[PDB]
């Protein structure tokens, strides 16, 4: 009767309530500063804002009814209190008996765990409201929200394989382009560190920027190991392309502003394959890139050139990319470590 995902959600939330349990209230009171009313206030105002945006219509999203949103919010508030208890009981400072007031007064966590729990609920129901709607109506920055996705996947083993597949989906959407928009808090994080971008060796071999760029680098290394297998290139060209992709992140970080991450990885691919004796054309490249799951055509057919005016991947390579990256590439007419 119910969908595999709607019935899995109902199993996790079964017997539980939209309120802290006696065990979580015993961890909230152990705290010099008890977080229970701050938590309930965050939840109240996230529920209000969700309901208001759910209840009213935009040119691209028709609004729907109070009753389906109050049910949708209630089941997400049950999942929140369950995943928060798992988080906090399994925390090192509970197993050592230390105060967890600081850990439980970080509002960005409570906001982004309620938001993830609302997207779990919405996707299980195949909602017309597709990510990034919840974090956009909840005023939540992609650069701060993605960090709870790993926490939810680790803290609820009842999550279906489709729900995990989706959560890893939206986490890569953030590491691809929603955290690189011009109004992203990532550029703030860069600013307070003198705009020095971490290199792969600094994060791979504890830092908002460190754990962002270590997920970025890991994701880009996966998408590169596929491209280099389906175009049969040398492992040392892979080492060289990867060094130019690092160069464009560290020394030309503005190239990612309001852009996609595979746009700078494909141009790193063509420019280093062309500088060496292993020339593969953008045509040969997009034929193999096409088969990658994140590849929609707009990645190589609607690239931002200046701002607005949009072109395609070849014209972005010729008008913007080669001017700022030829210096480095022409040195191959020290390579960075490639990880797993």
């Amino acid at each position: 009767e119910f969908t595999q995902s709607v019935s899995r959600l109902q199993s996790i939330v079964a017997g539980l309530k939209n309120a802290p349990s006696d065990q979580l209230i015993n961890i909230f009171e152990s705290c010099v500063r008890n977080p229970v009313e701050n938590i309930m206030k965050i939840l109240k105002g996230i529920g209000e804002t969700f309901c208001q945006h759910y209840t009213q219509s935009t040119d691209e999203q028709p609004g729907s009814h109070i009753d389906f949103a109050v049910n949708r919010l209630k089941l997400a508030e049950i999942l929140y209190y369950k995943i928060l208890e798992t988080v906090m009981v399994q925390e090192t400072r509970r197993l050592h008996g230390m105060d967890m007031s600081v850990l439980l007064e970080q509002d960005i966590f409570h906001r982004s765990l309620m938001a993830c729990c609302l997207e779990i609920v919405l996707f299980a129901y195949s909602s017309p409201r597709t990510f990034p709607w919840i974090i956009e109506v909840l005023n939540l920055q992609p650069f701060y929200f993605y960090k709870v996705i790993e926490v939810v996947i680790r803290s609820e083993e009842g999550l279906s394989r489709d729900m995990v597949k989706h959560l890893n989906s939206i986490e890569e959407q953030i590491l691809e382009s929603l955290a690189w928009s011009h109004d992203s808090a990532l550029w703030e994080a860069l600013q307070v560190s003198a705009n020095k971008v971490p290199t792969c060796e600094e994060v791979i071999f504890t830092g908002s920027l460190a754990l962002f760029y270590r997920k970025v680098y890991h994701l880009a290394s996966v998408r590169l190991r596929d491209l280099c297998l389906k175009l049969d290139v040398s492992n040392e060209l892979r080492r060289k392309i990867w060094t130019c992709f690092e160069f464009t992140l560290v020394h030309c970080p503005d190239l990612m502003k309001d852009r996609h991450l595979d746009q700078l990885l494909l141009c790193a691919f063509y420019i280093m394959a062309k500088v060496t004796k292993e020339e593969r054309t953008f045509q040969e490249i997009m034929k193999s890139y096409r088969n990658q799951p994140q590849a929609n055509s707009h990645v190589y057919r609607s690239v931002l050139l200046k701002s607005e005016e949009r072109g395609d991947l070849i014209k972005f390579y010729n008008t913007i990319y080669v001017g700022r990256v030829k210096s480095f590439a022409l040195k191959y007419d020290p390579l960075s470590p490639f990880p797993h």
């Binding site: 062309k274 054309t281 395609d312 991947l313 070849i314 390579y317 080669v322």
Partner: peptide, 11 residues
């Protein structure tokens, strides 16, 4: 290191 391709239509 200019690309001399015109379009990326052909697969």
């Amino acid at each position: 290191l200019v690309c001399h391709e015109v379009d990326l239509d052909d697969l």
